[PDB]
Design an enzyme around this catalytic site. Structure first.
Site: not given
Length: 281
Positions: A23-24, A57, A200, A239, A241
């Protein structure tokens, strides 16, 4: 038509699927909010039952997203959060856990982690963690970004052998923990949570990854997660999203990396041949 997700056992005996959800950076665009929430719901329904968050976060914003996502289905989720080390004193950890519970809208987290190593004695934080376990506010504690000396220091303090996980950076582009930390953790029965499993996004431009992805009609991201699936004692934390993202991540588990695939990945993403300092994001 999907194959089950392998599960990883914690020391206490609970099992979670090897593919979870991070959830970053959720919680920051109000336009994205409904999508973020729904991707986490989608994830849970696809069996990616671990959800990873933190107090940092967006200062509770990600926690609140998660809190909305799990309404009416608390039992479908394994919820992880974290305490920043600036808060990790004896009274501060308890206060942090309490704000986290409020944001999440729940009575008890499944796993609460110290986010990285800070200036409060490890023994204070562990004591706070154990008081919280005994109070029914957390089910288990662990750590994050702890290198091999931090783990040794941790064992030395009382109850420090109760550590349930170490969340560290691990992906094809960052394999330094294979040399020392990952084997220690496995030998200890302590799962490693691999954060930033796609580096990332930086990984996704690699040509070898793209080549192997074409060979399987898959995305590079999916091939990067299928790699981590072949690593025992590891829970990857992509992640989500977006609901489409969540389904993509889920189907990565259907990939069969061949024997030739794994040797090829090792050639292009070489395992460490010596001790390296733990990388952190």
């Amino acid at each position: 038509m999907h194959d089950p997700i392998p599960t990883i056992a914690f020391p206490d005996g609970r099992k979670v699927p090897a593919l979870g959800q991070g959830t970053w950076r959720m919680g920051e665009n109000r336009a994205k909010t409904a999508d973020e929430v729904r991707s986490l719901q989608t994830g849970l329904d696809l069996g990616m039952t671990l959800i990873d968050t933190a107090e940092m976060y967006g200062d509770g914003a990600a926690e609140r997203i998660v809190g909305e996502a799990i309404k009416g289905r608390r039992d479908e989720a394994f919820v992880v959060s974290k305490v920043l080390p600036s808060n990790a004193s004896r009274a501060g950890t308890v206060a942090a856990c309490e704000r986290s519970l409020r944001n999440l809208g729940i009575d008890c987290v499944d796993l609460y982690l110290l986010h990285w190593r800070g200036g409060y004695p490890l023994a204070e934080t562990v004591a706070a963690f154990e008081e919280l376990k005994k109070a029914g506010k957390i089910r288990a504690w662990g750590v994050s970004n702890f290198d091999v000396d931090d783990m040794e220091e941790l064992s030395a303090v009382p109850d420090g052998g109760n550590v349930a996980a170490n969340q560290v950076l691990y992906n094809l582009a960052r394999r330094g923990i294979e040399f020392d930390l990952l084997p220690r953790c496995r030998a200890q029965g302590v799962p490693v949570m691999a954060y930033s499993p796609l580096d990332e996004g930086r990984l996704l431009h690699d040509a070898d990854l793209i080549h192997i992805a074409k060979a399987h009609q898959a995305t590079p991201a999916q091939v990067a997660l299928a790699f981590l699936k072949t690593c025992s004692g590891v829970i990857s934390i992509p992640k989500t999203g977006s609901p489409e993202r969540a389904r993509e991540n889920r189907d990565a588990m259907d990939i069969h990396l061949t024997t030739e695939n794994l040797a090829e990945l090792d050639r292009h993403f070489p395992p460490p041949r010596r001790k390296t300092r733990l990388e952190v994001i």
